[PDB]
Amino acid sequence: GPAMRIISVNVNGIQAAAERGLLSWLQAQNADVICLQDTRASAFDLDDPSFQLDGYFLYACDAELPEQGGVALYSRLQPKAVISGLGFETADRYGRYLQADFDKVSIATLLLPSGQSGDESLNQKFKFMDDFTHYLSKQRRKRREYIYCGSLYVAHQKMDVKNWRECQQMPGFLAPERAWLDEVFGNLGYADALREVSREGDQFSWWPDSEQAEMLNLGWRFDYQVLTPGLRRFVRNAKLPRQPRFSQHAPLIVDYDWQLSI
Ligand SMILES: [Cl-]
């Protein structure tokens, strides 16, 4: 019966990640759609034939200054349409959004700023958040379903971070950041794909770049597949494997009881 697999990875530079084996690992995962974030590549850079995956169409969107963003989406089916951007600057100037439309459902790749390099960067992250809330408050009135493969740089609940008491003071688990996700998953009615099938802790998707973070698992769950409520009962499995990886982020692999078509 019906099945679809969607894999989402923040690659922290698609060339750096590819040099680490990302593409041959993806080729083998049996994904219907792959969503990448933070490619750091220009449209011309992504024209390099070694980024193509056999059996997949590849779409991308680049940041004005390519290193500041970029996202991409591979699909086995040729989507009905692909659109980029969200209609606000902290997305559109940074290639932080791209969407593929299928029958009844669109699947997107979404990237936020991390807000980790000072107050200016955190201002930019809060503004993106607020503008994205506004977009979702309108979009939830549409009839089609959406799967937002999102690299959010925000962990929602205590179980989504290791040592929540120290994290509370750092970008990623600030009170207004947790509040934003409470709004997304609460009043706005969206679903957290992994949380529809698992309430266990110790499932993280990002680690600072240090051997001590790696040995002690000082991880944060920053990567999600955020769902329209019509898809919430279709989730089958979700996994954030610690290995292999290609960046500071783990891949998020989610299977759904849904037969993708165009
Ligand atoms: Cl906010």
Residue numbers in the entry: 1 to 262
According to the publication:
Crc controls the sequential assimilation of amino acids and inhibits the expression of several genes involved in uptake and catabolism of sugars, alkanes and benzoate. Thus Crc protein seems to operate at the crossroad of metabolism and virulence in P. aeruginosa. Crc shares sequence similarity (25 to 37% identity) with DNA repair enzymes belonging to the family of apurinic/apyrimidinic (AP) endonucleases of both Prokaryotes and Eukaryotes. However, Crc does not appear to have nuclease activity.
Here, we report the crystal structure of the P. aeruginosa Crc refined to 1.8 Å. The crystals of Crc diffracted to 1.8 Å resolution and belonged to space group P3221 (unit-cell parameters a = b = 74.66, c = 123.16 Å), with the asymmetric unit containing one molecule. Crc is a compact, globular αβ-protein, consisting of two six-stranded β-pleated sheets flanked by six α-helices forming a four-layered αβ-sandwich motif. The overall structure of Crc shares high similarity with members of the AP endonuclease protein family. Four conserved catalytically active residues (Asp210, Asn212, Asp283 and His309 for hApe1), located in the cleft on the edge of the αβ-sandwich, are a determinant for AP endonuclease activity. Among them only two (Asp220 and His246) are present in Crc. The bulky side-chain of Tyr150 (corresponds to Asn212 in hApe1) protrudes into the active site, occupying the position of the scissile phosphate group of the DNA backbone in the apurinic/apyrimidinic site. The substitution of this residue to a serine in Crc makes DNA hydrolysis rather unlikely, which is consistent with the previously reported lack of exo- and endonuclease activity of Crc. With the exception of Arg37 (corresponding to Lys98 in hApe1) these positively charged residues are not present in Crc. Most likely, this results in a reduced capacity of Crc to attract negatively charged nucleic acids.
